[PDB]
Amino acid sequence: HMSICTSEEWQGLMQFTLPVRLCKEIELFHFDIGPFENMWPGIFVYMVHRSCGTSCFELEKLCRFIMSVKKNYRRVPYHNWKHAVTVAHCMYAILQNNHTLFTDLERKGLLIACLCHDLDHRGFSNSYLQKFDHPLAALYSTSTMEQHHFSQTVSILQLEGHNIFSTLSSSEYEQVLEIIRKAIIATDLALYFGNRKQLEEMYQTGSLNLNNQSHRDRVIGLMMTACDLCSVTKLWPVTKLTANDIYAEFWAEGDEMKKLGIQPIPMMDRDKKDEVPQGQLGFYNAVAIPCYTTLTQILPPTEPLLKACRDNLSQWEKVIRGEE
Ligand SMILES: Nc1ncnc2c1ncn2[C@@H]1O[C@H](COP(=O)(O)O)[C@@H](O)[C@H]1O
Ligand SMILES: [Mg+2]
Ligand SMILES: [Zn+2]
């Protein structure tokens, strides 16, 4: 059921060399992978090697894994291969700036979780799957697509020669799979609201303790949200272009809803594009800004993400004022 990369594909990745000039740029939060499509798999290999070490994973297995993951992302407008690498890069930047706060197991687990977090996404939301009783909603009662993304991740690891984690001891192996599962489930925005509120409180009252596993899990969860939404932390033109892709998917879902006789929310109605600017303002105020605000409080080095988010909020406000 899973697609598998070809030998030419993973061998080509093995020989890939990343232009010296990009090595420097990849360390920055605002880096946009957009103009280097042929290099995306190589960029991920580079980040893994820099954060986890060149011998962390058997190179051959890592290349097979990466190219098969790419092949299992669909050709949809937004939840695609580009998105996966973009989210993984934001995680890389967060980890590089807060390196020793995380174990080697967590770093390899999180970079992989980010690359795989939207595996096999079809362009339809949990809202849609549950409203229309898709088989996946029956199998996974909550965080439907996310539970599916994790299942897809495990399925790729099970492909012959694709298990990059097999060299871990049995206890570390079970630990990394759990790190990956929790990280992917955390990408369900529905869970973000409660997670952020809890973390904000733990931080404000001084009870937040990274030696407390449940606390670590929550911090990692907020990091996942931050990486998943990072298009809002890029330079304005990049942020705006990505929003076009996000809405292309929203509109397609809303079209299907109308076919089933249900009026979609304005955000998914292609006949209500005039409401987009206000919709974005709402998303930034209710989701993005608070996310990066709390993340910066817990991990000070991530402040550039919050500053960039605030800048884009201002841009959407300019659009609303007719200054576009
Ligand atoms: N700028 C945005 N405006 C509205 N919704 C967004 C925006 N960026 C991300 N999202 C939502 O956040 C979700 C993140 O979860 P996912 O990308 O599926 O892991 C996306 O599926 C979108 O539904
Ligand atoms: Mg997702
Ligand atoms: Zn995503």
Q: Which helix H or strand E contains 63, and what residues bound it?
A: helix 59-71
What's the domain count of the chain?
A: 1
One-letter amino acid of 87? V
User: Is residue 218 packed enough to be buried (19+ CB in 10 Å), middle (13-18) or exposed (0-12)?
Assistant: buried
Query: How far apart are the CA of 34 and the centre of ligand 1, in A?
Result: 18
SS3 of 122-162: the string is CCCCHHHHHHCCCHHHHHCCCCHHHHHHHHHHHHHHCCCCC
Query: How far apart are the CA of 234 and the centre of ligand 1, in A?
Result: 15
Q: Which helix H or strand E contains 228, and what residues bound it?
A: helix 213-228
- Domain that includes residue 226, residue range: 1-324
**Sequence-separated (6 or more) residues with CB below 8 Å from residue 184:** 113, 116, 117, 146, 149, 150, 153, 224
Could you tell me how far CA 239 lies from the centroid of its own chain?
15
CB burial readout 3-34, b (16+ within 10 A) else e: ebbeeebbeebeeeebeeebeeebeebbbbbe
Could you tell me how far CA 287 lies from the centroid of its own chain?
15
Which one of 1, 30, 49, 79 is the catalytic residue? 79
Q: What is the CATH number of the domain that holds 300?
A: 1.10.1300.10
> CB of 225 within 8 A of CB of 305?
no
Q: Nominal resolution in Å?
A: 1.6
The coordinates were experimentally obtained by X-ray
Residue 140 CA to residue 142 CA, distance in Å, equals 6
Q: In the numeric block, which tokens belong to residue 237? A: 């033109």
Q: What residues are in contact with ligand 1 under a 6 Å CB criterion? A: 79, 117-118, 187, 189, 228-229, 232, 243, 246, 280, 283
> CB of 253 within 8 A of CB of 124?
yes
Residue 101 CA to residue 95 CA, distance in Å, equals 8
Residue 182 CA to residue 176 CA, distance in Å, equals 10
Q: Is residue 79 annotated as a catalytic residue, yes or no?
A: yes
Residue 121 CA to residue 124 CA, distance in Å, equals 7
Contacts of 101-108 with C-beta under 8 Å, sequence gap 24+, read 101/210, 101/299, 104/52, 104/53, 104/56, 105/168, 105/172, 105/175, 105/176, 105/179, 106/179, 106/220, 107/51, 107/52, 108/48, 108/51, 108/52, 108/56, 108/57, 108/176
Q: Closest Cα partner for 292 from 279, 311, 317, 315?
A: 311
* Residues of each annotated binding site: 79, 83, 117-118, 228, 280
Q: Which helix H or strand E contains 105, and what residues bound it?
A: helix 104-116
Query: How far apart are the CA of 281 and the centre of ligand 1, in A?
Result: 14
Angle at 34 between CA 180 and CA 49, to 5 degrees: 45
